[PDB]
Short mmCIF file of C-alpha atoms in Angstrom, two decimals:
data_model
loop_
_atom_site.label_atom_id
_atom_site.label_comp_id
_atom_site.label_asym_id
_atom_site.label_seq_id
_atom_site.Cartn_x
_atom_site.Cartn_y
_atom_site.Cartn_z
CA UNK A 7 -30.72 -26.56 14.56
CA UNK A 8 -28.69 -27.10 11.41
CA UNK A 9 -27.38 -30.60 10.72
CA UNK A 10 -27.58 -32.33 7.33
CA UNK A 11 -30.43 -30.06 6.27
CA UNK A 12 -31.62 -30.63 2.68
CA UNK A 13 -31.96 -27.47 0.61
CA UNK A 14 -33.35 -27.25 -2.90
CA UNK A 15 -31.55 -24.83 -5.22
CA UNK A 16 -33.61 -21.79 -6.22
CA UNK A 17 -31.56 -20.45 -9.12
CA UNK A 18 -28.41 -21.33 -11.06
CA UNK A 19 -25.35 -20.12 -9.19
CA UNK A 20 -21.90 -20.53 -10.68
CA UNK A 21 -19.19 -21.16 -8.12
CA UNK A 22 -16.14 -19.07 -8.95
CA UNK A 23 -13.50 -20.27 -6.51
CA UNK A 24 -12.47 -23.46 -4.71
CA UNK A 25 -14.51 -22.96 -1.54
CA UNK A 26 -17.58 -21.80 -3.44
CA UNK A 27 -20.41 -24.24 -3.99
CA UNK A 28 -22.06 -24.40 -7.42
CA UNK A 29 -25.86 -24.47 -7.42
CA UNK A 30 -28.24 -25.77 -10.06
CA UNK A 31 -31.89 -24.80 -10.17
CA UNK A 32 -33.75 -28.04 -9.61
CA UNK A 33 -31.07 -29.80 -7.57
CA UNK A 34 -30.57 -30.19 -3.83
CA UNK A 35 -27.65 -29.46 -1.50
CA UNK A 36 -26.88 -30.68 2.02
CA UNK A 37 -26.71 -27.75 4.42
CA UNK A 38 -24.53 -28.18 7.48
CA UNK A 39 -23.35 -24.70 8.41
CA UNK A 40 -25.56 -21.62 8.39
CA UNK A 41 -24.22 -18.26 9.54
CA UNK A 42 -26.11 -15.19 10.77
CA UNK A 43 -25.72 -13.69 7.30
CA UNK A 44 -26.22 -14.76 3.70
CA UNK A 45 -23.27 -17.16 3.60
CA UNK A 46 -24.21 -20.78 4.25
CA UNK A 47 -21.98 -23.84 3.94
CA UNK A 48 -23.28 -27.00 2.34
CA UNK A 49 -22.34 -29.90 0.11
CA UNK A 50 -23.56 -30.48 -3.43
CA UNK A 51 -22.80 -34.06 -4.56
CA UNK A 52 -19.16 -33.67 -5.53
CA UNK A 53 -17.96 -30.63 -3.60
CA UNK A 54 -18.67 -28.71 -0.41
CA UNK A 55 -18.42 -25.02 0.35
CA UNK A 56 -20.13 -21.66 0.64
CA UNK A 57 -23.36 -20.72 -1.09
CA UNK A 58 -25.77 -17.74 -0.79
CA UNK A 59 -28.85 -18.39 1.35
CA UNK A 60 -31.04 -16.44 -1.09
CA UNK A 61 -30.33 -19.13 -3.70
CA UNK A 62 -31.67 -22.06 -1.67
CA UNK A 63 -35.01 -23.46 -0.62
CA UNK A 64 -34.71 -24.98 2.86
CA UNK A 65 -38.17 -26.51 2.69
CA UNK A 66 -40.92 -24.24 1.50
CA UNK A 67 -40.56 -20.73 2.90
#
């Protein structure tokens, strides 16, 4: 399933709003929630929120 799943950031993604999650190429986020579409919900040391699935590496491909 999806519980505390580590995901490595693919590309730099600037979070615009409060519930958006900023991503840095090279870093890793903790994925908890993953929807049926491109909006996933994970925590990046400091804040939690929504990030695009196309911008994260679950583990490989």
